């Protein structure tokens, strides 16, 4: 990955102003509803039978926050993301057995949720940088699957 200074600036800007406790639960809920097969890993979370149950599930909420804060390390290491995420990649593959395509789906849900929060401020350029960052993180999270 080659980052431009303006991409760095945007990523920094977005995460310094992110309300993780709002965006995280919103993005994971959305993923579970729009892409319900991701529910595969949340069997111990309590009721998920319909959208309102999921939006209302406090456990899905705290996990969305955790997943969102999992991005923090790549922001803080923009040039070494593949290496930084290797242990998380290994975890998701060998212990959690999570299909890495779901990383892309959750990513798009994070983008769509952030877009609703930022509104008009989520410009195409902003989107391009944010997606680029998420794509580089997702690549890394799928890297140790063998």
């Amino acid at each position: 990955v080659e980052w431009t200074d303006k991409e760095r600036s945007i990523i920094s800007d977005i995460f310094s102003h992110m309300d993780y406790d709002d965006i995280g639960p919103k993005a994971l809920s959305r993923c579970l509803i729009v892409y319900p097969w991701t529910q595969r890993h949340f069997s111990g979370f309590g009721n998920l039978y319909n959208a309102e149950a999921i939006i209302g599930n406090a456990n899905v909420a705290a996990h969305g926050i955790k997943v969102l804060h999992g991005l923090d390390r790549g922001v803080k290491n923009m040039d070494n993301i593949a290496a930084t995420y290797a242990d998380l990649s290994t975890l998701h593959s060998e212990k959690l057995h999570v299909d890495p395509d779901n990383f892309k789906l959750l990513s798009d849900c994070i983008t769509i949720v952030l877009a609703a929060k930022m509104g008009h401020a989520f410009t195409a350029e902003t989107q391009g940088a944010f997606q680029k960052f998420l794509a580089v993180v997702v690549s890394a999270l799928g890297k140790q699957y063998h």
């Binding site: 959305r30 877009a115 609703a116 195409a124 989107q127």
Partner: protein, 142 residues
Amino acid sequence: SLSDKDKAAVRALWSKIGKSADAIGNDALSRMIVVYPQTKTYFSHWPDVTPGSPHIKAHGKKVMGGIALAVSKIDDLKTGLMELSEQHAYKLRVDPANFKILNHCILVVISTMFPKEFTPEAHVSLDKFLSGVALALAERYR
């Protein structure tokens, strides 16, 4: 396929945001060409392949006109979009992978402009709808 729940959801959201179809179109095509610049290949016959340009603005009008068309034809998208399918297939030769890209951008656009209306429930239904539009547009290809 779209259930009655799905169709009512798409109908209700489009009832709400349809007034803004033109602006939705410009914003979505603008996002497509900046975030996914490989898509600009289809518009090389235009000098003005840049966000919000006159060809993009006017074009975004036609595209969301096509989505409004699809909403009115939602019980049978294949029949409904057959002429548009023929256009993208033989005149335009647009690889159907690009419909997925534009669909994402429209969702992003509507999330920015109608966050209250674009509930997770609205989203899963409209996503199913747009995947169906994409399938119908591929009808005449091969």
